[model samples]
Target: AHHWGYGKHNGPEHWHKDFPIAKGERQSPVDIDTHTAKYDPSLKPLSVSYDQATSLRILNNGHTFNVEFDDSQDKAVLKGGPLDGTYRLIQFHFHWGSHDGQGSEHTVDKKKYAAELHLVHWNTKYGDFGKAVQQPDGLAVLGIFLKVGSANPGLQKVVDVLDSIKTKGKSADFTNFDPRGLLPESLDYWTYPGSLTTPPLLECVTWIVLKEPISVSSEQVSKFRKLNFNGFGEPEEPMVDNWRPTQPLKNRQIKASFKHHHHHH
Candidate 1:
């Protein structure tokens, strides 16, 4: 079996050797050029409904820490905002670097952030997440950029549990926590067709990356790098920079929910 990771030998550059879709037309983690993004007046406001009780547990998946949710029902779902139908919240995770300078998967005009948060959702029309992963328009991931500034209380809930699951395949109950508390005030986003940023590189996601970023303390950002890439008994390796490089845009159009405005300092 071919194993893939963020190591020197199995990194993004080598991903195409195993998963051909890694070089597909609509790959993710693209550089979002705000000036060129088309403003779509037709995009509706993002409607998010998350039941705190639906949150199941937090798991250290080696690649990143994933906070899984109970998607059996419509307890937590997302509608509107460039989506045609309802999409259920399945899980949320992050990708970061060893330090604060660069970590985000997606960049804005080639500028990187400290980290990136991915809120994974699946289309309800597909019946379940399994079926959704195989279809083109089956997944919708909300990408939020994390910058170093004031400590974010919303993220502290998930960060506090990281110590218990520092190793891979470890999980603990993380109930009654609302994921919506992590979002920014503005739901304005850049929309584009893309594939999964990881292996198998499935071209089944509609990437909705938020324009505004949320703040987190530098200390909190450092803790994320403490996670281990190797599981128990294996040579421990720090899980950092677990992000793919920007891919070519090909013939895809990038749409913005907000009107094009002058760049601010």
Candidate 2:
């Protein structure tokens, strides 16, 4: 299910064959300037309070060491609970490229970053995630983009664990980890509705894309490019590239909060 990168094939055009849906609407790599200054004030800024309840555990999931939140893990809980009900952290994964320079799944203004991290949560509003997945607002994601820059202290906190699961068919448990320690300073973000960038591209997601990006050392990024999906026991091509090509925008409108847009010089 993976293609592109290195000496392999290179862009979205190559994916249209196996996945005709790649031609569908709402693909990412969206231009940030596509939106106007008109921002909505009613949209609630997500409430995230860091606490000892937060815990990080690695799953022996086939591909990468898939990190997930244990239901009882109280060190990190979604503050304010949830928009309409309680939301629980399901699984957290990452999207990266083959090179140290660019590998993010969603780009801003045609600009590609070094990597992107996705922390996926499921709304308990519709019972459990299985049931919630059937609803339009059942999922929420906190997307953090990583840019290439001088070594970042915050990034080291996570990347340092790479060697723990560097090879295929291996995983290590990470407990009592502080999720907030890795968050970027600004909570300012862009909120929008979009389909999953992966297959079964479900349109039931509330996306909160952090306006600011965190930095990671180039050496740290190289580790990600080495990941392979086929390493997860799948017959796929070793997952050279795991990104889904950007889809059509259709008529969807992406919005941001007014507070973030009024940047003063």
Candidate 3:
């Protein structure tokens, strides 16, 4: 395995040396020009059907903490929108910063948010996540922005266990929690072809970024900095600023879906 860290040496700037696709045309986390995102009337609303019992565990994999899901059955899935087939919920994770001023992988009009949440999914027809990540239309990731404001009850559920996973490569059993509650009131979005924001930066993901942001208290968001980049006794350092900078958009088109309907309506 190769080593990559959000540091002076192995940070994103150096990733292109190891992974050429890091500079690929379809790279992710591009700045969304809210005005330039033309409205597409043809796009459908994104739908997510999640089962509370599908959650398996919450783990810190040195890069970011993610809640693993049991995608064995169709317990959780993403459909509609620009998607062509059903994509299973693979996992959910976040990208944050040392300070709230400069976080989030994608930006809006070049304005950064406090954090970004990624709900990763894969197409069953393409086999597992490993194989799916290698195909053009095999993966779909939904990005949700976290704005600094009132405390978010849904986010606090994951924050409640940060004490147990304080270091790299740590995990705790986390189940029966549904991820659907983390979304904002609006599902309007902007989507484009993109790649993984991390190394092995595969260009397979179909990026779906919600327009509205979910609120989180500044105090709760700070707790994520407690994680370590290195495991215990291995040159420990706080894990912060794990997000990659926005990449070139090339000739790609960002499709916009702009209807925020209430559920009871």
Candidate 4:
């Protein structure tokens, strides 16, 4: 059976064979063409309140490693910035390249970053995450780019545990961690309607991509490459280039929240 993976046989190019929505108009990881993006003054500043105690465990889900959170309560939530209600922060994961140059899913002005961070959230009003994902405005994903620079202390904490979950289907206890430290100085972002980059690609996401990129040393990105796509019993396969290629914007319009002084007449 040809399973869905980053390998050439079942990579993104072949996703549409299993998931028809892979070619949907509202698909995600589209290139953010800064020059063409419209500036909207109506967009509000985003609010993120994450309870440090809500963090549960970190797991390698074959495609990517995620730091999962407890969503039984209203502790970790995100609001505002193209969103009407509280969206629970379920988990955060990263997509990186094999080397230092190109790894991010969404590019800015065709500029690729070393990695990309996705903080996945689901709208609470829609009840459980399962129900929410089926709705049009059910999800809000915060995308943060990771530029190759000095080592990030916050990222190091997660990187330190990489050895434990080196293979797919592995997980370890990870708790009481605040995700705020991983954010960049500015929260200004571009918003758009898009789908999940991976399989079963649902078109329920409201993307909020940050303008400023966070720091992540080349060494940190290398650690991510060290992770395996193979399970314990399977032949070893290095996990690298897990990101989906940029999708077409189609009739969709990407709006920016940041002010454009040059555009003012």
Candidate 1 lDDT tens digits, 1-265: 5578899988888999889999899999899998888887888988877754288899998899999999988888888988999999999999999889999999998999999999999999999999999999999999999999999999988888888998999999999878877899988899999999998889999999999999989989988988898889999899999999899999999999888684332
The lowest-lDDT stretch of 10 consecutive residues in candidate 2 is 73-82
Write candidate 2's Cα lDDT for 95-161 as tens digits: 7667765667666666777778877777766656677666778877777888888777755655667
Instruction: Tell me the number of clashing residue pairs for each predicted model.
Output: 0, 8, 0, 0
Off by over 4 Å in 2: 1-29, 34-37, 59-65, 72-75, 79-83, 167-169, 232-240, 259-265
TM-score, cand. 2: 0.78
- Which pairs clash in the backbone of model 2? 26-248, 27-247, 52-75, 53-74, 53-75, 53-76, 54-75, 54-76
Comparison by TM-score, 1 against 2, better one: 1
Judge candidate 3 against the unseen true structure and give its global Cα lDDT, from 0 to 1.
Answer: 0.89
Question: Which stretches of model 4 miss by more than 4 angstroms?
Answer: 51-53, 260-265
RMSD each, Å: 2.0, 4.2, 3.5, 1.4
Candidate with the larger TM-score of 1 and 3:
1
Tens-digit per-residue lDDT, 6-90, candidate 3:
9899999999999999989899889987666777889888987775438999998989999999987677898899999889998
Determine the backbone clash count of candidate 3.
0
Q: How well does candidate 4 score on lDDT at residue 220?
A: 87
Global CA lDDT computed for model 2: 0.61
The residue-level lDDT of candidate 2 at 6 comes to: 27
